[PDB]
Amino acid sequence: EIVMTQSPATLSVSPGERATLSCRASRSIRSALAWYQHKPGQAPRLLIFGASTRATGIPARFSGSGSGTDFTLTVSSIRSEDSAVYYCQQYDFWYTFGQGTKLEIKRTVAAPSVFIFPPSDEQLKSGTASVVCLLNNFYPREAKVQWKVDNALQSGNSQESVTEQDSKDSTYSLSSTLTLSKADYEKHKVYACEVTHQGLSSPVTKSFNRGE
Amino acid sequence: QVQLLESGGGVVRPGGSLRLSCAASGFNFEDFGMSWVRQAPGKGLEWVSSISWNGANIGYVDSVKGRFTISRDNAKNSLYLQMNSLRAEDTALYYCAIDWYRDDYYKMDVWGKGTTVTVSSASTKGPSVFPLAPSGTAALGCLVKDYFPEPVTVSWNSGALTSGVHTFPAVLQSSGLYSLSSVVTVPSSSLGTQTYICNVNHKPSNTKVDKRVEPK
Numbered sequence: 001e002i003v004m005t006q007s008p009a010t011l012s013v014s015p016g017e018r019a020t021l022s023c024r025a026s027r028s029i030r031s032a033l034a035w036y037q038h039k040p041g042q043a044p045r046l047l048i049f050g051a052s053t054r055a056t057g058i059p060a061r062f063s064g065s066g067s068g069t070d071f072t073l074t075v076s077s078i079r080s081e082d083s084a085v086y087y088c089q090q091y092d093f094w095y096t097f098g099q100g101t102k103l104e105i106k107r108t109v110a111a112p113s114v115f116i117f118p119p120s121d122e123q124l125k126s127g128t129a130s131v132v133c134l135l136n137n138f139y140p141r142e143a144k145v146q147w148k149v150d151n152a153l154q155s156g157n158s159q160e161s162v163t164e165q166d167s168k169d170s171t172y173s174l175s176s177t178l179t180l181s182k183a184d185y186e187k188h189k190v191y192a193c194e195v196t197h198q199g200l201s202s203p204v205t206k207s208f209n210r211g212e
Numbered sequence: 213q214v215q216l217l218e219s220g221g222g223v224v225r226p227g228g229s230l231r232l233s234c235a236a237s238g239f240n241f242e243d244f245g246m247s248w249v250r251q252a253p254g255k256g257l258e259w260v261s262s263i264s265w266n267g268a269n270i271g272y273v274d275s276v277k278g279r280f281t282i283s284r285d286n287a288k289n290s291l292y293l294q295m296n297s298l299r300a301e302d303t304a305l306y307y308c309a310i311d312w313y314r315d316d317y318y319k320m321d322v323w324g325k326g327t328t329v330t331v332s333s334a335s336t337k338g339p340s341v342f343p344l345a346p347s348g349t350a351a352l353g354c355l356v357k358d359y360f361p362e363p364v365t366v367s368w369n370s371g372a373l374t375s376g377v378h379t380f381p382a383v384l385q386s387s388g389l390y391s392l393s394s395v396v397t398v399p400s401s402s403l404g405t406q407t408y409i410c411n412v413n414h415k416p417s418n419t420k421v422d423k424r425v426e427p428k
């Protein structure tokens with residue numbers, strides 16, 4: 001089978017600049033090479049076919065070229081909406097996608113807005129308490145979250161989740177969920193969420209008192 | 213509104229079988245070759261199978277030869293994929309797509325939304341939905357906890373509310389069940405005059421929940 005090798009794996013590029021993506025075929029695919037944009041949550045979108053021909057409605061800032069085994073796609077005047085995974089696909093002999101290039105839009109540093117949510121009374125009826133800490137609209141993606149219960153640092157009882165890069169403002173959001181039994185939850189008063197990020201002067205703490 | 217609509221996904225034990233279907237509308241289905249393309253969790257797009265417009269040329273990726281069978285019914289405007297001897301690597305979202313117009317030219321610019329195949333011994337469980345209650349800008353949300361399998365869809369005010377919404381990717385809990393949150397930031401002044409309802413749908417278990425999120 002034909003192996004399609006893409007490079008680089010990842011790419012972080014600021015708006016207005018241009019980035020070049022490379023695709024290599026293990027043997028000649030002549031000109032039957034296509035490029036796809038795949039935004040998370042949507043179907044793949046054809047950008048280029050025939051190595052260098054733009055599909056319907058694709059603007060001129062998408063430029064593809066190549067022949068045989070070596071191909072490029074150059075994306076100029078990059079916009080926040082370009083945050084996506086880009087795939088090549090040979091269609092000379094059936095079809096093979098490359099492993100994809102994930103393009104992140106490098107924007108300016110933005111600090112997290114932090115919110116904490118106590119467990120709902122409804123959930124407490126089930127015997128579990130989920131304390132959720134929200135970090136909203138920050139960049140870059142790297143952020144640290146520490147849980148402190150009655151000034152005791154928590155470890156091993158939380159899980160994080162990060163959204164895909166926002167297509168309009170290029171930020172990320174992160175949730176950390178502290179999960180405790182109803183009994184363990186009801187033995188302590190202060191539940192705190194401490195957030196460290198490059199855009200904050202010192203770490204930020206949001207807390208609540210159980211019952212207030 | 214050319215449209216491709218996949219259906220038939222679900223949970224099937226390893227070694228089992230499933231039949232996927234794709235209903236086309238808005239074009240001459242008999243004029244186009246069709247392909248199945250899948251995306252396994254945490255992986256890229258992988259072409260699976262193709263049948264030409266007239267059934268004269270049929271292809272499969274090597275790993276599904278002898279297990280999958282593609283077919284079409286032009287009278288029903290439908291494409292099918294019979295998936296036998298399911299493996300863990302078959303767990304994926306399955307898209308149908310046109311590929312060629314006849315034997316004339318590659319087109320491949322019409323795709324469906326995908327249907328999910330989960331290869332597992334585990335049982336289907338629907339989610340519980342709890343509110344994330346608010347306290348210039350306020351944040352509120354919904355906690356969708358303890359469901360299987362993926363995925364869950366969340367909207368706000370039946371899709372009217374979209375600005376400021378963040379639905380997080382699910383997290384696999386140690387219990388084997390998935391959990392996620394969906395949040396939105398809103399003006400504080402609107403907290404009492406505006407209603408906020410998240411709409412959670414988990415098709416595999418026929419769970420539809422509409423949760424009001426009010427200040428406590």
Ligand SMILES: OC[C@H]1O[C@H](OC[C@H]2O[C@@H](O[C@@H]3[C@@H](O[C@H]4[C@H](O)[C@@H](OC[C@H]5O[C@H](O)[C@@H](O)[C@@H]5O)O[C@@H]4CO[C@H]4O[C@H](CO)[C@@H](O)[C@@H]4O[C@@H]4O[C@H](CO)[C@@H](O)[C@@H]4O)O[C@H](CO)[C@H]3O)[C@@H](O)[C@@H]2O)[C@@H](O)[C@@H](O)[C@@H]1O
Pocket residue numbers: 032091092093094095244245246262263264265269311312314315316318
């Ligand atoms: O290194 C070995 C060589 O591998 C490749 O060639 C292998 C041999 O295949 C032929 O040449 C290629 C020609 O293949 C087409 C054929 O028309 C058709 O018949 C093939 C079967 O016979 C062989 O025993 C098996 O390979 C096959 O099972 O199938 C292939 C592929 O056809 C589909 O692929 C593209 C996708 O865009 C499209 O043309 C066809 O798709 C299907 O058809 C309809 C549209 O008509 C679509 O709806 C549907 O997807 O096609 C190539 C010209 O581009 C030839 O390469 C023999 O000539 C080879 O010996 C190849 O990589 C070669 O360069 C290598 O040397």
